[PDB]
Amino acid sequence: MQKSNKINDALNQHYKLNVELGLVYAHYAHVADDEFDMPYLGKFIQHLSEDKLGVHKEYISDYFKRNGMKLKTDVSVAVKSIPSDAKALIQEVYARENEVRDHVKAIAKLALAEDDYESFYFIQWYVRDGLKDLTEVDDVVKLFNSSNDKLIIEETIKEMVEEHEIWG
Amino acid sequence: MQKSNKINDALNQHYKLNVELGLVYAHYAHVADDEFDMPYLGKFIQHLSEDKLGVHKEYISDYFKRNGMKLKTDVSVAVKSIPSDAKALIQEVYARENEVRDHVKAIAKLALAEDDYESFYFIQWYVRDGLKDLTEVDDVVKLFNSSNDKLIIEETIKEMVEEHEIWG
Amino acid sequence: MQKSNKINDALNQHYKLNVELGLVYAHYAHVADDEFDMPYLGKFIQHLSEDKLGVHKEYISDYFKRNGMKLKTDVSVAVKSIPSDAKALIQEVYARENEVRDHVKAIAKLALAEDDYESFYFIQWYVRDGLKDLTEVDDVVKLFNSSNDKLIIEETIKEMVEEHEIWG
Amino acid sequence: MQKSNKINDALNQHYKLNVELGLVYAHYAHVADDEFDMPYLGKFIQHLSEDKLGVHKEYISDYFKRNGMKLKTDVSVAVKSIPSDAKALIQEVYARENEVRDHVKAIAKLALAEDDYESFYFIQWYVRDGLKDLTEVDDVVKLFNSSNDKLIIEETIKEMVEEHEIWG
Amino acid sequence: MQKSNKINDALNQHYKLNVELGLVYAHYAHVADDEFDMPYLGKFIQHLSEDKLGVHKEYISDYFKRNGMKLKTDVSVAVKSIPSDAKALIQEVYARENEVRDHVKAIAKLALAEDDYESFYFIQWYVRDGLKDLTEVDDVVKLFNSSNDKLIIEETIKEMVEEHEIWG
Amino acid sequence: MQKSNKINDALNQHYKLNVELGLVYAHYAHVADDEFDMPYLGKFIQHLSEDKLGVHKEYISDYFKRNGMKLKTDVSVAVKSIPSDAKALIQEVYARENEVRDHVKAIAKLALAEDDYESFYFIQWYVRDGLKDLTEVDDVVKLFNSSNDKLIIEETIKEMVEEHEIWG
Ligand SMILES: [Cl-]
Ligand SMILES: [Cl-]
Ligand SMILES: [Cl-]
Ligand SMILES: [Cl-]
Ligand SMILES: [Cl-]
Ligand SMILES: [Cl-]
Ligand SMILES: [Cl-]
Ligand SMILES: [Cl-]
Ligand SMILES: [Cl-]
Ligand SMILES: [Cl-]
Ligand SMILES: [Cl-]
Ligand SMILES: [Cl-]
Ligand SMILES: [Cl-]
Ligand SMILES: [Cl-]
Ligand SMILES: [Cl-]
Ligand SMILES: [Cl-]
Ligand SMILES: [Cl-]
Ligand SMILES: [Cl-]
Ligand SMILES: [Cl-]
Ligand SMILES: [Cl-]
Ligand SMILES: [Cl-]
Ligand SMILES: [Cl-]
Ligand SMILES: [Cl-]
Ligand SMILES: [Cl-]
Ligand SMILES: [Fe+3]
Ligand SMILES: [Fe+3]
Ligand SMILES: [Fe+3]
Ligand SMILES: [Fe+3]
Ligand SMILES: [Fe+3]
Ligand SMILES: [Fe+3]
Ligand SMILES: [Fe+3]
Ligand SMILES: [Fe+3]
Ligand SMILES: [Fe+3]
Ligand SMILES: [Fe+3]
Ligand SMILES: [Fe+3]
Ligand SMILES: [Fe+3]
Ligand SMILES: [Fe+3]
Ligand SMILES: [Fe+3]
Ligand SMILES: [Fe+3]
Ligand SMILES: [Fe+3]
Ligand SMILES: [Fe+3]
Ligand SMILES: [Fe+3]
Ligand SMILES: [Fe+3]
Ligand SMILES: [Fe+3]
Ligand SMILES: [Fe+3]
Ligand SMILES: [Fe+3]
Ligand SMILES: [Fe+3]
Ligand SMILES: [Fe+3]
Ligand SMILES: [Fe+3]
Ligand SMILES: [Fe+3]
Ligand SMILES: [Fe+3]
Ligand SMILES: [Fe+3]
Ligand SMILES: [Fe+3]
Ligand SMILES: [Fe+3]
Ligand SMILES: [Fe+3]
Ligand SMILES: [Fe+3]
Ligand SMILES: [Fe+3]
Ligand SMILES: [Fe+3]
Ligand SMILES: [Fe+3]
Ligand SMILES: [Fe+3]
Ligand SMILES: [Fe+3]
Ligand SMILES: [Fe+3]
Ligand SMILES: [Fe+3]
Ligand SMILES: [Fe+3]
Ligand SMILES: [Fe+3]
Ligand SMILES: [Fe+3]
Ligand SMILES: [Fe+3]
Ligand SMILES: [Fe+3]
Ligand SMILES: [Fe+3]
Ligand SMILES: [Fe+3]
Ligand SMILES: [Fe+3]
Ligand SMILES: [Fe+3]
Ligand SMILES: [Fe+3]
Ligand SMILES: [Fe+3]
Ligand SMILES: [Fe+3]
Ligand SMILES: [Fe+3]
Ligand SMILES: [Fe+3]
Ligand SMILES: [Fe+3]
Ligand SMILES: [Fe+3]
Ligand SMILES: [Fe+3]
Ligand SMILES: [Fe+3]
Ligand SMILES: [Fe+3]
Ligand SMILES: [Fe+3]
Ligand SMILES: [Fe+3]
Ligand SMILES: [Mg+2]
Ligand SMILES: [Mg+2]
Ligand SMILES: [Mg+2]
Ligand SMILES: [Mg+2]
Ligand SMILES: [Mg+2]
Ligand SMILES: [Mg+2]
Secondary structure, eight states, X not given: OOOOHHHHHHHHHHHHHHHHHHHHHHHHXXXXXXXXXXXXXXHHHHHHHHHXXXXXXXXXXXXXXXXXXXXXXXXXXXXXXXXXXXXXXXXXXXXXXXXXXXXXXXXHHHHHHTTOHHHHHHHXXXXXXXXXXXXXXXXXXXXXXXXXXXXXXXXXXXXXXXOXXXXX | OOOOHHHHHHHHHHHHHHHXXXXXXXXXXXXXXXXXXXXXXXXXXXXXXXXXXXXXXXXXXXXXXXXXXXOOOEEEEEOOOOOXXXXXXXXXXXXXXXXXXXXXXXXXXXXXXXXXXXXXXXXXXXXXXXXXXXXXXXHHXXXXXXXXXXXXXXXXXXXXXXXXXXXX | OOOOHHHHHHHHHHHHHHHHHHHHHHHHHHHHHHTSOOHHHHHHHHHHHHHHTTHHHHXXXXXXXXXXXXXXXXXXXXXXXXXXXXXXXXXXXXXXXXXXXXXXXXHHHHHHHTTOHHHHHHHHHHHHHHHHHHHHHHHHHHHHHHOSOHXXXXXXXHHHOOOOTTTO | OOOOHHHHHHHHHHHHHHHHHHHHHHHHHXXXXXXXXXXXXXXXXXXXXXXXXXXXXXXXXXXXXXXXXOOOOEEEEEOOOOOXXXXXXXXXXXXXXXXXXXXXXXXXXXXXXXXXXXXXXXXXXXXXXXXXXXXXXHHHHHHHHHOSOHHHHHHHHHHHOOOOTTTO | OOOOHHHHHHHHHHHXXXXXXXXXXXXXXXXXXXXXXXXXXXXXXXXXXXXXXXXXHHHHHXXXXXXXXXXXXXXXXXXXXXXXXXXXHHHHHHHHHHHHHHHHHHHHHHHHHTTOHHHHHHHHHHHHHHHHXXXXXXXXXXXXXXXXXXXXXXXXXXXXXXXOTTTO | OOOOHHHHHHHHHHHHHHHHHHHHHHHHHHHHHHTSOOHHHHHHHHHHHHHHTTHHHHHHHHHHHHHTOOOOOEEEEEOOOOOSXXXXXXXXXXXXXXXXXXXXXXXXXXXXXXXOHHHHHHHHHHHHHHHHXXXXXXXXXXXXXXXXXXXXXXXXXXXXXXXXXXXX
């Protein structure tokens, strides 16, 4: 029952992505409220920041404790440019969440290639959450194409931040 | 009522410290439970990680929204070596918390030098919390000098993780 | 423990400002609802009027009772011109609240220059409230730049008038 | 249904009286507790200050919103001399409240002279309150003629500040 | 983050003052009830004795535990003369409480001179309480100038011994 | 029914002992937690400090009020040396409590020699409490001879600080 080093590597990479994405999202949330005058969009992005810097990373660490895998902490992130407006901020978040889905697929494929069924089981959570988080972000992006009034959008977002049988 | 760039710089530096310290503490918490077989010490360090990556950073961002100061996100951290044992892990945390106190003092001094009384008010929270957090860490360090049995220490720590009128 | 006459003067000046600002705000609230057809903006300005003519002045009087300082009542205010629209009404309120912050800073500086630490303690409330009140006003100003529909703005304001750990 | 300019003038004058009387009463309340060592008399005068700077002025503004009358804000008040003792302080309040009654009578007379029955209806509140407020003040004045002991008077006043079918 | 020896000295001095003042107040409370036949005045002075020998001293000790400062216990007090009457007993208490305020100011000044912002934070409690305790004592002193009947005064004091947003 | 001057003297001496012992115990409690890293032992000694500086002294003062005896306040205490360890700290407390018992016996003997049966009745409380307090202290001393692990002792003490039909 020796741990897979490839899976160990891939999951340390996912830990990093989650840490760094959450830090970018914290800045993006600040910018939503401060510069773009959209506090509820900020609360949405802040809640996603906390999701990435919380359970998304913690489950990897917990799993590692259980199987012998080593946790690595190497984090480098800088927000050097901000999107121009709020539509583009949420569109950037979307693209980053679609990339999460790609990364998770690769891990699942690797687990099966490695006959690591515990790792294939563990990553099902992230397979499901990849679509859940993408859908939540997609719901907000759409509002920017349904209304040209920031305060309507803001009112719709505040009802969003106030489980599906499959997608959680 | 123009914002101080020195104070802006100093507080962006404190944001970074908090982010990075919290990430080191997350790794240290993992190591406490996994390698040093001390789960309750890990819960203590995890709760401190979440304090640093939460309110400690968020208050700076909130303050910036209110005053015009710019938030910067530039984070670089790597855990390249781990302390040898649990005593030394909590002693490293202590040293890092004593350095927090030094950094906070400098900000308070600067605020007064700048006649930025809103910033002197805002940092009182961190002045107080510098001693509070240091004391919490100090209480754990002491246990390692009061007992040579990991499980006694663990039992004492679990009652610690289950407000002072001045120190919060 | 003799009272500072400079601090006495400065705080009698702050009492006057608060009385007079509250009276201007009462008129401005009336104008918001009557002429600009924005009743919820009026309730916001009325609540700020009552804040200025209440606790803001009362705490100064209470403090004076406790320390020997003399209260002076000399009030002169006339609303001779009204802003053209609602955006400009809330922008005028903003400017007047930013000036409050300047005045409070001066008092805090003076207290420290005078070694009047009771007065430096007493004014911390106003240091904090200077930013709190400015932020509340800033939140409303922003709405006028996020929507060109008075009734959307009105709906957003009514959820605002229906404590932060630092800013109160 | 065009608004009466005479009634508009008279009611803007009553608004001013109420604002200014309330400000004098706030100072007088401070003096009662601080200099005359009578805190409960101060609470009585403070409650009358808040009555004058609250409902007494607000109803005029509300009425104006409803009928087209213009609100004017021109306030000038200075407390340049204080009565010598507490008896005389409450006797001054009395005289000022008896003058309120005269002013209200004039408004009622004018409304009838103008065939402004909405204004005659609106001022009935102030006709009634003119006697109510005068009676409350009269009850306190009497105590100063019933006892030569400040603390007896104070004890009687504190039970006063802890509706008649006609007088409200 | 080395502790200030001057601040250590000054706070050991404040500990002593509090211990000794509380012991004088215990005797003074006894004298109020026994010799001056004023039991409620005694309960007031006893509650102040317990305040000085409790939180006032304990917070200093707690603070010392947290920062490395050394507690010293050197106490010398003797009540060799008693004031002649009750008015003078409460007037002596007043003078001793006004001196507390002077001593606390000096500590705050020293903390700022020393750039000891933790100590400046810790002493804010005592800055505030210096005025609070003085005001409580002042309220009783006044009664002796408002009535020449011990039992009226006693009745007023018993309602006093049966938080302000700023002064606690 | 004239009061005994010998009993008056002896009870003024017991008042002094209680005041001074309580002050030594407050320092000893501080040392237990700070230097000896034993917070629960400190809470035990702090509770004994408060017992001595509270009821133990107050009952003497109350008794004096009732019988004509004069209270004297002459207090001199300095903690010039601290015991080396925690065992010795609690052993010093023990010795001081055994001496309390001797002193109380003398008072009881004197009361009977003086035919002061009210004083013999009053001191029964202290006769009983002499053994009660000694037993409480004895229970802690024993722990230091039952375990060589500070944290076991600490855990046992914390269940002690979380009435016998005879001994109270
Ligand atoms: Cl870079
Ligand atoms: Cl935007
Ligand atoms: Cl995409
Ligand atoms: Cl693969
Ligand atoms: Cl590296
Ligand atoms: Cl270990
Ligand atoms: Cl260190
Ligand atoms: Cl500086
Ligand atoms: Cl004018
Ligand atoms: Cl408008
Ligand atoms: Cl402005
Ligand atoms: Cl200045
Ligand atoms: Cl004038
Ligand atoms: Cl008077
Ligand atoms: Cl009259
Ligand atoms: Cl007429
Ligand atoms: Cl002497
Ligand atoms: Cl007397
Ligand atoms: Cl004095
Ligand atoms: Cl100094
Ligand atoms: Cl000595
Ligand atoms: Cl020890
Ligand atoms: Cl012994
Ligand atoms: Cl004998
Ligand atoms: Fe906001
Ligand atoms: Fe969610
Ligand atoms: Fe765009
Ligand atoms: Fe998620
Ligand atoms: Fe809605
Ligand atoms: Fe809803
Ligand atoms: Fe809702
Ligand atoms: Fe809804
Ligand atoms: Fe809704
Ligand atoms: Fe709903
Ligand atoms: Fe576990
Ligand atoms: Fe905590
Ligand atoms: Fe070691
Ligand atoms: Fe903290
Ligand atoms: Fe246990
Ligand atoms: Fe427990
Ligand atoms: Fe438990
Ligand atoms: Fe327990
Ligand atoms: Fe337990
Ligand atoms: Fe418990
Ligand atoms: Fe309306
Ligand atoms: Fe408010
Ligand atoms: Fe405009
Ligand atoms: Fe305010
Ligand atoms: Fe709505
Ligand atoms: Fe709502
Ligand atoms: Fe609602
Ligand atoms: Fe709603
Ligand atoms: Fe709604
Ligand atoms: Fe709501
Ligand atoms: Fe008062
Ligand atoms: Fe009333
Ligand atoms: Fe007179
Ligand atoms: Fe009225
Ligand atoms: Fe009564
Ligand atoms: Fe009653
Ligand atoms: Fe009552
Ligand atoms: Fe009653
Ligand atoms: Fe009563
Ligand atoms: Fe009653
Ligand atoms: Fe009694
Ligand atoms: Fe109190
Ligand atoms: Fe006298
Ligand atoms: Fe106090
Ligand atoms: Fe009564
Ligand atoms: Fe009562
Ligand atoms: Fe009562
Ligand atoms: Fe009562
Ligand atoms: Fe009563
Ligand atoms: Fe009551
Ligand atoms: Fe502790
Ligand atoms: Fe006990
Ligand atoms: Fe030993
Ligand atoms: Fe006892
Ligand atoms: Fe236990
Ligand atoms: Fe238990
Ligand atoms: Fe328990
Ligand atoms: Fe238990
Ligand atoms: Fe237990
Ligand atoms: Fe139990
Ligand atoms: Mg295969
Ligand atoms: Mg300067
Ligand atoms: Mg200076
Ligand atoms: Mg007619
Ligand atoms: Mg300096
Ligand atoms: Mg015999």
